[PDB]
Design a protein around this ligand. Structure first.
Ligand SMILES: [Mg+2]
Lengths: 602, 597
């Protein structure tokens, strides 16, 4: 059952180890396409002949095209920022995509079908429908749907469009046919569960188009529809979506995050109750699976339980899960029949399917619990071009109930149901090929997501007790938290130095040493990324951490931030002990050397 | 240097993959260059012992099985490839070879153009593409970028208009002296340039001003009506829905018998709203309409705006040139300067844009394109008439300062979408650098398309058929503004419009493929209905000219139209078209015989 699937065979390789394989398969596919143009329908005629191809103007034009491509080729290689290789690159980026996804794009692009125009793309249109079904099955939706989006931010925007329109439907039904919602107060109309709204819409029958005309689509009083509650670290990104969708940026309300950088569910409830008390509705809540700088996974199960509790008090909220980064990781929890694996059996199933090379606990109970609850969310974002290992650009959205698409649809198949317009069939081919090489369960993506998580854990373990002596100073590595997923963060700190401004200065100077300045010829032996956790975006979420290092709350406010060394361990190659242990002493040496340069330059 | 003998035949794989080996040779060179770049003392994580292990070989075989399934679907669940001379429908899938090759190569890096660090070369390429767009459109101080598609480019244009309309009031809220003495009506009719100048004068206050703009969600419907040609009414309802003004704020403007926006109607509509003190959020003019290839009189709209400004009325102008945008290259000389009308045929002959020295471009089309530089924003799609592979749309803005009105905190800060592939920028860049956006490059390609359309149009206006005792005529719709050509077949003297609609639908079914078709057809067409809700009475003059009554028009509610968008480059040559002409005629005869059988 794909038991001994070997991930090394599914990538070009950091050193182009499988380059010839890629080239061979690429040429086979291109040959298939060229043969199809030539022979699929004999006649023709050929519009271009040898007499044309051997003319001087033709040959000149080929030379001109070569000059353009050679220029393009040179610019990309000259400006490029040396290829990241496993063991040396421990930063936030990844440029290693699945070979079948690459090949499928290359091949399908030759037909250049547009997936909104079926006639140009019958094959890739069907592939995108299957991808939608595969997303729905991955998320445990029994009657859901999904599609590929131009990118992940547009997928989130589409989720908000869904929430906005759905929230407005009971009022739209009241205006078109009061009998549909007779005996319900306006507050009750604004707190109707989504499935009930959808049932009512379907029940409007002949009147559905008229109801849609009176919904948020009409633009009437969008701020009546309530507040959009998001983790504080996502507040800025959601302001843009709220701005675009017309509810306005003040309708986005930040919810504090905790010391795990997950949404604080006690705070979530307090905020909801505050608005409910003044009869301000909640348009929706966003839970994050795989935060941008910490890989944190919000307690989706706790949010769902909270909603169930509040419904007894007449409060409902739409739930959107942003699993842009963490979506494919749900494949860890589905067996070969796509059934959700009970927690007590997870390590057993993972060993049987060689998901992890060592039998240990990698997935936290609270992470498992969050993933289990995804099937309760109205919508979920999941991006193939993040942890799906599909080339940019490919985002994704999944909806709980296929009927939801009727709330945003425009008529006169696929094009009627989406926010965007024209879209490449090649993208659908690319995602489809990835999904069919690696099924969305433990037999396929479970292994790939597993390899990444295992690499993260090895790196975390390596950092945990790391100590250095530089110019007579003891310097310690302090990992931020044990990873919920595959992102690992840490700070370097001079022992006994309790000046937080100085620690930030250290980690900033360290990052600059362990990174490239453009025009860089030499590849380094250790590259990292970085970010700041600043009060305006993080609140006091990092306070317990900085206090654990010996800093005071007074010190925390004086600095107003903490600088963090960042890794997103997306490479699949660091799961093997042999592979990581080879690099461990070399990383240690690189860090020692970088720290020396830092201290030397003062 | 001037690319005088640039040969379009060398720039495509070809309908029969005539240039297939060239594509492969160039592709392999590029792939080799990337692979060698990755290879530039560490051990390899994928060793030779790994690659020769049984599990590795088994996995490779698994991958090959998947790609074989992919291949079967795409090859066999397909509509046959378009064959020039036989295919006269509304679509095109052929792409410029350098655009394909550039994408193939760049995507190997998997750069993301919102993260410059991830993609410095392709980020520069997208900036250059934006500048190239601005130059094509005559915008001395403008900018642009690639968008996922044209519908999103239109949405972004509306986002701009919406935010910009709201800025005068926003400025009043933050600093009344910026707009002292200005009534609310004056605030709602400030020309965009004045708004941008004031916003620049606001200096560091810009961020607080933006908080009080339409970004706040407040007073969206106060911003006024969005006026679009009737044939775009439905598509703009979706954009207005998304952006929060609401579909109720979209107002259809009647189109004329040339399927161009009626500018007298536009003026009547604007004056009526302005007399009520309802502002106009904006007007959309279309260059290259969806089913007729019509070009609105952008120049007439610009002149109307100037007239109305004297009376305290302003409107934002967005030009939707998704289809017709690259055709502006017909009007730019080798130094990208607009060609005087009297010199157009001379310059076109000097540069082999057209195969004959005669008139091809209507004066009113020339005039419309010349006025583009007065529009606040313009949509243009590389994946339509730029021959770049999907997905690649585009937007151009008149004044770079406009991007400050929609920005969030380079490139990612200034756009509606998020992540965008560096490969997409490479693909557009390679097309633009192979074919400059003037008569030396795209002029030739857009010209070849227009000329094919003209030959087809001339051929259609002399066609009669004797079939099953009946006499059938072809009636072309209108002379093309661009490269779209439409017609109807009709039984002579038959005044039943429902019957004519029946005939044209049945003809289309004979002259089209289905998924899985294998028998080659000598003639393929597309079709659409011009129905009253989208067209109003614009086709009434046409149907009356054929003998149908106005009563008959209302009875049927629509007219069925046989559709062609001549995007092939090969029908510009007389020798080529004249070969297929007798064949098309015989195919129409045969298809009609089947219809009437
Ligand atoms: Mg000028």
């Amino acid at each position: 059952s794909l038991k001994d699937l070997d991930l090394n065979a599914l990538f070009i390789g950091d050193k182009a180890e499988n380059g010839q394989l890629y080239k061979d398969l690429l040429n086979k596919l291109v040959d298939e396409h060229l043969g199809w143009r030539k022979n699929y329908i004999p006649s023709d005629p050929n519009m271009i002949g040898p007499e044309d191809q051997n003319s001087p103007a033709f040959k000149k034009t080929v030379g001109h095209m070569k000059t353009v491509l050679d220029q393009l080729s040179e610019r990309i290689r000259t400006e490029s920022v040396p290829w990241h290789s496993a063991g040396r690159y421990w930063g936030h980026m990844n440029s290693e995509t699945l070979m079948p996804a690459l090949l499928a794009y290359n091949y399908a692009m030759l037909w250049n079908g547009n997936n909104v125009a079926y006639e140009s793309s019958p094959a890739t249109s069907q592939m995108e429908e299957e991808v939608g079904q595969e997303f729905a099955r991955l998320m445990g939706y029994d009657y859901g749907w999904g599609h590929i989006v131009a990118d992940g931010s547009l997928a989130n925007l589409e989720g908000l469009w869904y929430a906005r329109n759905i929230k407005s439907l009971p009022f739209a039904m009241k205006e078109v046919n009061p009998e549909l919602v007779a005996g319900k107060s306006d507050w009750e109309l604004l707190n109707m569960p989504t499935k009930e709204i959808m049932d009512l819409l379907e029940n409007a029958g002949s009147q559905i188009d008229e109801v849609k005309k009176r919904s948020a689509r009409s633009g009437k009083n969008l701020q009546r529809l309530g507040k959009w509650l998001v983790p504080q670290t996502k507040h800025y990104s959601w302001m843009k979506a709220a701005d675009i969708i017309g509810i306005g940026l003040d309708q986005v309300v930040p919810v504090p995050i905790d010391s795990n950088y997950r949404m604080d569910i006690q705070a979530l409830e307090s905020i909801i109750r505050k608005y409910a008390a003044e009869k301000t509705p909640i348009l929706g809540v966003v839970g994050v699976a795989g935060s941008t700088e910490e890989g944190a996974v919000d307690g989706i199960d706790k949010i769902v339980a909270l909603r169930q509790k509040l419904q007894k008090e007449g409060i409902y909220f739409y739930l959107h899960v942003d699993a842009a980064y963490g979506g494919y990781a749900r494949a860890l929890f589905l067996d070969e029949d796509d059934q959700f694996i009970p927690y007590k059996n997870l390590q057993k199933v993972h060993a049987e399917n060689h998901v992890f090379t060592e039998d240990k606990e990698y997935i936290k109970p609270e992470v498992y619990a969050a993933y289990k609850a995804f099937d309760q969310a109205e919508s979920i974002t999941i991006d193939p071009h993040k942890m799906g290992y599909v080339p940019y650009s490919a985002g994704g959205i999944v909806i709980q109930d296929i009927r939801m698409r009727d709330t945003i649809s425009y008529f006169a198949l696929l094009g009627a149901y989406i926010l965007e317009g024209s879209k490449a069939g090649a993208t659908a081919a690319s995602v489809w090929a990835a999904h069919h090489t690696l099924p969305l369960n433990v037999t396929g993506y479970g292994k790939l997501e597993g390899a990444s998580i295992e690499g993260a854990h090895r790196y975390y373990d390596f950092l945990k007790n790391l100590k250095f002596e530089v110019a007579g100073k003891r310097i310690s590595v302090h990992p931020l938290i044990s990873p919920d997923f595959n992102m690992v963060d840490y700070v370097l700190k001079e022992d006994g130095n309790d000046d937080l401004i100085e620690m930030n200065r250290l980690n900033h100077a360290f990052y600059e040493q362990a990174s490239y300045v453009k025009g860089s010829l030499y590849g380094k032996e250790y590259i990292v990324s970085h970010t700041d956790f600043a009060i305006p975006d993080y609140g006091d979420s990092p306070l317990a951490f900085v206090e654990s290092l010996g800093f005071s709350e007074v010190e925390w406010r004086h600095a107003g931030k903490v600088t963090i060394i960042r890794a997103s361990v997306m490479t699949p190659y660091m799961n093997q002990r042999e592979n990581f242990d080879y690099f461990a002493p070399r990383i240690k040496k690189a860090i020692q050397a970088d720290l020396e340069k830092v201290y030397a330059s003062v």
